[PDB]
Design a binder for this molecule. Structure first.
Ligand SMILES: OC[C@H]1O[C@H](OC[C@H]2O[C@H](OC[C@H]3O[C@H](O)[C@H](O)[C@@H](O)[C@@H]3O)[C@H](O)[C@@H](O)[C@@H]2O)[C@H](O)[C@@H](O)[C@@H]1O
Ligand SMILES: [Ca+2]
Lengths: 1271, 148, 80
């Protein structure tokens, strides 16, 4: 690694890490390439190295297989250049040879691996055509080249050809597409209905054999077999289970001792697949029945099953564990046989219980078996990964279902996706509906009781020190709102108004700015909503973060021009000379125009950044681990050791002196240079750009540290007043002289324009202030000899001497700490610093220096960067503006973008990928306390600390674990109020960042150093709740919209939704609301937008449960883990003895099961003994049936329409089905009605409408809206 | 640890336990995909993870291919990444070139100081002689690069 | 020819191509001639060479059926 690729005269050269031009065969970064004696690279040709004859590809130049004509003859070769023997090879033109034992190609007919193939006179393989080998005529397949039956059109009549090349007479024969035909004694294909060998087949107009096709063929119904297309009468019932009684001598023994929670393991009264129960008696040791004692629980599946399919699987599985004769049982097996077999397994079970003196072994056997079954694992949960589903595999929305699951009813709350732009639900039908579901258990923030609890938490954090240590200096000052677009936007108003009430943030800039607060608000329309609502918290500015991506930070070669930073479209016709603002553009552009910002037009206050803990970090760091085989998927679970190893590669790539970056970001110093000089923004700095993102906190600085540190201290000293920004560029494309080098300038304290010469207040602060920034994205940039580049430092800086702070070159970026050690340069009369291709600068006393305006490439830059400041700056010079106590504004708003707000800098002082502390002394917050000084002097006014909440860790109740959780970063937590408290046994129990004391000391230390502390407010979700409940759940995408092809709708599901109730959420939950309602009544009386209601503190949340949640990620338990009778579709329950529903076997009643005919029709009874009504039922041979409300199977009559419309208790199944005379539902096939119209019915039996439909043989058909087939 | 073809000519791979593989799997160098039922995807695209990958008709192996997105041809490499500033093939065997903006190029094109000829359809033409710069030019059988 | 005779132990086994210089091939044919005359004296016979030449000659496409367009359709099925 570490050598660049260069192109000279049309050819690729490779120059080493050494700096040497490369000849010969070389494996460079896992690719095998060759360079001739001049050092040019070879593509699409063969070369000889050692005794190897190696071909290299024509695109890539990479070693791969080919055929060379060597002397007279063809010879195959592999990737390493070895002559191939007894192998296929494809050559450059996609042609195929087979070389034998001697390396010589086979010619003519041959058989290989049981496949018959042909080769032309040159040894090339014939594919996709006929061929007259010998006397006969054979077709060979397109890709494999294998001999197969095919048809060709001779004269105007189709003819058939078999695999041996013989024409077909009196038989069926296929074509390559997959259609079967039949050809008579005279070789001609047959049409229409045909009876051959005592069986009848249906061939359409085209002569295609139709299989799984229902139609009235003799004027009498006929279904054509899916296997061979042979017509059955569909009069014989296909079900193989007659009505039988199940009761026997064991029934009363295995029956439940009680029909209630005593004798049944349950959740909210319901039963699950792995429920154990208390049978009346126990066949102890397989010998003697003995009454059971309370502790003698046994698995429900020893005695009961939902259907015969499941029963048969259980028996086979338990057999395989040594418990019985190993058996192949199917759903077709007679019920009697299965039940007898279940008892001999029961016997064996009781024997192994006595032998082992344990039931744990069984628990584990049952668990294993249960997850085998599709209804009891994720397969019935429709895992998907598009959208935010990418994180966890998909989501379930809980439903208000007072009849079945009343503890889980939310009281008609659960308004989903009430993001800012959809706070009133007016975009619920569009993509403008918010993605309410993100991670773990999503909290219902549309419920006023929950809203009140979020405020209690908010108060708790803002007064954390007062509450937990009676230390009024250990309290958080502001907040970051995590996942704004995934929650009900009411939370913003709740938070905003709280800050107004307690801190008078809407009074003045000084009050507002004392409690700096930010939003993670990614939607492109969030900034303007936030501004309409008075900027209670600062929006992010993605438009600038975005442009850094395109123009500097992301990629090599192609990048958007620096021109794009201007957003000239801001002005009408992009006329910088005339500068008329465009009042009505397509709602686009960068948030704050900086072409000529004199502070005269008000703008939206904001924070901005280059990177974040969750931007340009998470993905790169994992791509690095993937690329080095440490994990396979982005979602994969990894250990800390796995992370540390991957981090070494990430670091190695970051600091690569080559200057190329695979995972890391380019031009970071240059990006920060712009960020930290921009007017009308509060910049934020990412810990991971200053120190390494892995390992210990502040363990090692990054390579960018000194440059960014310098920029930061200089920002205090020089950054103030108006701004200008221009580029040596007019658009996408560059004219001759043009460099596309950007120039950004700030003038000084009261100087707002280029041409302004002095302040209005006649303060002189401005003279030694101001700054010049030049940046390029082109590391191969070379200037014309004529060309000059100019920084208009302004007419307030005529004839002044300026000195460099920071200058790029070919080995790095030099940083100058003071005026003396840096090159100076003086401005002209108009105040411009002029630069040429070649420059000769003079130090103020020390020396004379040479410097080229040259694009460079190294670890610290891929482009140009120069920063210049005025010499003669005082030691304590401070260009910041303090915020005023006066009520400047009656606009209602909290924050205002001005010089005072711009005097802030936020430091996001953590990384998600930090290692766990090796010792108490190195914990992040311990370190922050000792190092607070350092950040004061970089100008940080607010320190954004990680989320301090106790990690849910490795705990995982089902479904996909997330990295937040297993990396303990604090975004995944179980207890919202536990910020590092000790165990109740007295022992320390720090978070990743340290104990609660460590945190309070860290916060105080920041206040002692004049900095604020930001609390991460995470209201969207909570992880790993230990208590289970039964919810009613529907499968949904991020926006809470039901998946289109899902039968998982309003199903009962066991979720983990209930908190421990003996945690810190229980201690501190709701406590402070009463105090606050008394003190600030209006907060509790003010209506919220999304609900029309005020917050409701009448109910306190000490323990979470499902009624307060919108849903969960899928937990891999199954759609029917909660047990149900297929016949009535009623779920089993034992909560209240007045409304018990169990299988009759467990109640020692007689459960009859099977199909039984009577004069009216056919009825069916489930294993649990109940009659099928208004439900679909599947028999042991895989056929499906529908039983109407009356309890009778639907079946077609002679002369009547077989198509029947169904409306069932199970709504998802509603639709039009085709039932045959024996009740069988047609599936995945065409069905004719009484009138001769054809329809199609899908995988699940439903009619299909208004779409084209494809065939495995490439036949296409169309179905009209009314269902009929146009074809 | 073997492939099996069923009645319909569909293909599964069963692992060490006899149980079918699901999702993305690497058999030796070869990269393949398997649906939720364990069936091997052959002759079609597939959105595995973040990216989008075409799998070959009979081998089922991951390879470069082109599809028409909106009204413009786009190129897809073997890793499922769309192609920008490079040549990429399609399964048929044609090579195309896609510029910085991902759009296929047409006509005579000079790239990295060499000249290649792309026809109306965007196919790179090899072993093609013609008066291209108003001056004779033979395009290489190897790489399609113009020689004098 | 040079490659074939080489493979029988008569010279350094070689990949020679039509691209190889005429000079090199002619030099190499003589070192093969030398090796040939040695095995003629050593064996006191030329039959071994007759069989070697026969074999080599049929190696070449112009001197075997490949330039004869073997076919088997019609009565050509009998003898090619
Ligand atoms: O054992 C499997 C199979 O092997 C051969 O067919 C493979 C394959 O060959 C061709 O495609 C290969 C591909 O190779 C390089 O990438 C070339 O540069 C390409 O042009 C070329 O397409 C052929 O096009 C395919 O149809 C074929 O599937 C044997 O031919 C088979 O008999 C054998 O079963
Ligand atoms: Ca949410």
């Amino acid at each position: 690694t570490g050598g660049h690729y260069e192109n000279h005269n049309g050819y690729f050269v490779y120059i080493d890490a050494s700096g040497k031009q490369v000849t010969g065969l070389q494996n460079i970064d896992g690719n095998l390439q060759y360079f001739d004696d001049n050092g040019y690279q070879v593509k699409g040709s063969f070369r000889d190295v050692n005794g190897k004859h190696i071909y290299f590809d024509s695109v890539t130049g990479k070693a791969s297989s080919n055929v060379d004509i060597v002397n007279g003859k063809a010879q195959g070769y592999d990737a390493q250049g070895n002559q191939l023997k007894k192998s296929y090879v494809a050559d450059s033109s996609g042609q195929t040879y087979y070389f034998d034992g001697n390396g010589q190609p086979l010619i003519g007919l041959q058989t290989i691996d049981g496949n018959l193939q042909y080769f032309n006179q040159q040894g090339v393989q014939i594919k996709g055509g006929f061929q007259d080998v010998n006397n006969k005529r054979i077709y060979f397949a397109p890709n494999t080249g294998n001999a197969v039956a095919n048809t060709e059109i001779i004269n105007g009549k189709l003819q058939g050809r078999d695999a041996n090349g013989n024409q077909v007479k009196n038989a069926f024969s296929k074509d390559v597409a997959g259609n079967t035909f039949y050809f008579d004694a005279n070789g001609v294909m047959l049409t229409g209905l045909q009876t051959i060998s005592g069986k009848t087949y249906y061939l359409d107009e085209q002569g295609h054999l139709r299989k799984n096709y229902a139609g009235t063929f003799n004027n009498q119904f006929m279904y054509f077999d899916a296997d061979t297309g042979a017509g059955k009468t569909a009069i014989e019932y296909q079900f193989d289970q007659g009505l039988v009684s199940q009761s026997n001598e064991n029934t009363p023994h295995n029956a439940a001792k009680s029909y209630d929670k005593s004798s049944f393991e349950n959740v909210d009264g319901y039963l699950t697949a792995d429920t154990w129960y208390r049978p009346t008696d126990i066949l102890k040791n397989g010998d003697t029945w003995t009454a059971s004692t309370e502790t003698d629980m046994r698995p429900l599946l020893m005695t009961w099953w939902p259907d015969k399919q499941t029963q048969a699987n259980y028996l086979n599985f338990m057999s395989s564990k040594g418990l019985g004769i190993t058996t192949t049982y199917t759903a077709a097996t007679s019920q009697k046989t299965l039940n007898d077999a279940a008892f001999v397994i029961q016997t064996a079970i009781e024997q192994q219980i006595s032998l082992k003196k344990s039931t744990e072994w069984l628990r584990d056997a049952i668990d294993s078996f249960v997850k085998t079954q599709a209804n009891w694992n994720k397969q019935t949960e429709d895992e998907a990964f598009d959208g935010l589903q990418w994180l966890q595999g998909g989501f379930l929305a809980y439903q208000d279902d007072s009849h079945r699951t009343p503890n889980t009813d939310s009281g008609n709350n659960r308004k989903l996706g009430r993001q800012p732009i959809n706070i009133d639900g007016s975009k619920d039908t569009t993509d403008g509906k918010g993605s309410e579901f993100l991670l773990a258990n999503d909290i219902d923030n549309s419920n006023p009781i929950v809203q009140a609890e979020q405020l209690n938490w908010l108060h708790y954090l803002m007064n954390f020190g007062s509450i937990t240590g009676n230390n009024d200096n250990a309290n958080f000052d502001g907040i970051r709102v995590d996942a704004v677009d995934n929650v009900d936007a009411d939370l913003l108003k709740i938070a905003g108004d709280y800050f107004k009430a307690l801190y008078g943030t809407d009074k003045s800039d000084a009050n507002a700015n004392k409690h700096l607060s930010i939003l993670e608000d990614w939607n492109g329309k969030d900034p303007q909503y936030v501004n309409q609502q008075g900027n209670a918290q600062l929006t992010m500015d993605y438009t600038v973060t975005s442009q850094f991506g395109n123009s500097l930070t992301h990629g090599a070669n192609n990048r958007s021009n620096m021109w794009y930073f201007l957003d000239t479209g801001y002005y009408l016709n992009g006329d910088l000379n005339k500068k008329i603002v465009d009042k009505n553009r397509p709602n686009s552009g960068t948030l704050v125009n900086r072409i000529a910002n004199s502070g005269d037009t008000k703008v939206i206050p904001n924070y901005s950044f280059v990177r974040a803990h969750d931007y340009d970090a998470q993905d790169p760091i994992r791509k690095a681990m993937i690329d080095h085989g440490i994990i396979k998927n982005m979602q994969d679970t990894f250990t800390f050791d796995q992370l540390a190893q991957g981090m070494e590669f990430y670091y190695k790539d970051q600091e690569n002196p080559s200057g190329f970056k695979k995972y890391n970001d380019y031009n970071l110093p240059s990006a920060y240079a712009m960020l930290l000089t921009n007017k009308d923004t509060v910049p934020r700095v990412y810990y991971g750009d200053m120190y390494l993102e892995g390992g210990q906190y502040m363990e090692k600085g990054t390579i960018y540290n000194p440059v960014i540190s310098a920029l930061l201290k200089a920002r205090i000293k020089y950054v103030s007043g108006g701004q200008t920004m221009a580029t040596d560029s007019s658009g996408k494309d560059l004219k001759d002289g043009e460099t596309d080098l950007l120039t950004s300038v700030r003038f000084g304290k009261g100087i707002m324009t280029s041409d302004q010469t002095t302040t209005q207040d006649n303060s002189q602060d401005y003279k030694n202030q101001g700054i010049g920034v030049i940046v390029g994205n082109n590391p191969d940039l070379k200037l014309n000899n004529d060309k000059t580049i100019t920084l208009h430092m302004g007419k307030a800086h005529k004839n002044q001497l300026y000195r460099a702070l920071v200058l790029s070159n070919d080995s790095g970026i030099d940083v100058y700490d003071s005026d003396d050690k840096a090159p100076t340069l003086r401005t002209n009369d108009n105040g411009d610093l002029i630069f040429h291709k070649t420059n000769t600068f003079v130090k103020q006393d020390g020396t004379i220096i040479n410097y080229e305006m040259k694009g460079s490439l190294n670890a610290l830059i891929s482009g140009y960067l120069g920063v210049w400041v005025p010499v003669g700056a005082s030691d304590s010079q401070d260009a910041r503006t303090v915020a005023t106590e006066s009520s400047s504004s009656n606009d209602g708003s909290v924050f205002h973008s001005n010089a005072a707000l711009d005097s802030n800098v936020i430091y996001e002082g953590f990384s998600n990928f930090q290692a766990m502390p090796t010792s108490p002394e190195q914990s992040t917050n311990v370190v922050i306390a000792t190092k607070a000084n350092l950040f004061k002097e970089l100008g940080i006014t607010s320190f954004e600390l990680a989320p301090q909440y106790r990690s849910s860790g490795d705990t995982n109740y089902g479904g996909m674990s997330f990295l937040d959780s297993f990396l303990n970063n604090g975004y995944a937590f179980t207890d919202r109020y536990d910020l590092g408290f000790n165990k109740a046994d007295g022992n320390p129990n720090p978070t990743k960042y340290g104990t609660d004391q460590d945190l309070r000391n860290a916060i105080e230390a920041l206040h002692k150093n004049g900095m604020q502390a930001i609390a991460d407010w995470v209201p969207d979700q909570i992880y790993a709740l230990p208590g289970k409940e039964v919810v009613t759940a529907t499968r949904v995408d991020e926006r809470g919209n039901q998946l289109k092809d899902t039968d998982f709708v309003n199903l009962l599901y066991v979720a983990n939704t209930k908190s421990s109730g003996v945690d810190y959420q229980a201690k501190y939950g709701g406590e402070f609301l009463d105090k606050l309602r008394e003190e600030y009544p209006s907060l509790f009386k003010q209506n919220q937008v999304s609900t029309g209601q005020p917050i409701d503190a009448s109910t306190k949340i000490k323990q979470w449960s499902a009624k307060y949640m919108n849903g969960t990620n899928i937990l891999h338990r199954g759609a029917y883990y909660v047990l149900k009778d297929w016949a009535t579709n009623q779920y089993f329950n034992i909560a209240k003895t007045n409304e018990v529903f169990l299988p009759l076997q467990l109640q020692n009643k007689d459960a009859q099961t099977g199909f039984i005919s009577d004069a009216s029709g056919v009825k069916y009874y489930s294993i649990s003994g109940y009659q099928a009504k208004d439900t679909f039922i599947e028999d042991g041979n895989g056929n499906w049936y529908y039983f109407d409300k009356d309890g009778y199977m639907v079946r077609s009559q002679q002369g009547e329409n077989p198509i029947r419309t169904v409306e069932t208790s199970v709504n998802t199944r509603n639709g039009n089905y085709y039932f045959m005379p024996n009740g069988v539902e047609l599936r995945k096939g065409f069905g004719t009605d009484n009138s001769g119209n054809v329809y199609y019915f899908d995988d699940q039996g439903k009619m299909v409408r208004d779409k084209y439909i494809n065939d495995d043989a490439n036949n296409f058909y169309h179905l009209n809206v009314d269902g009929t087939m146009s074809r």
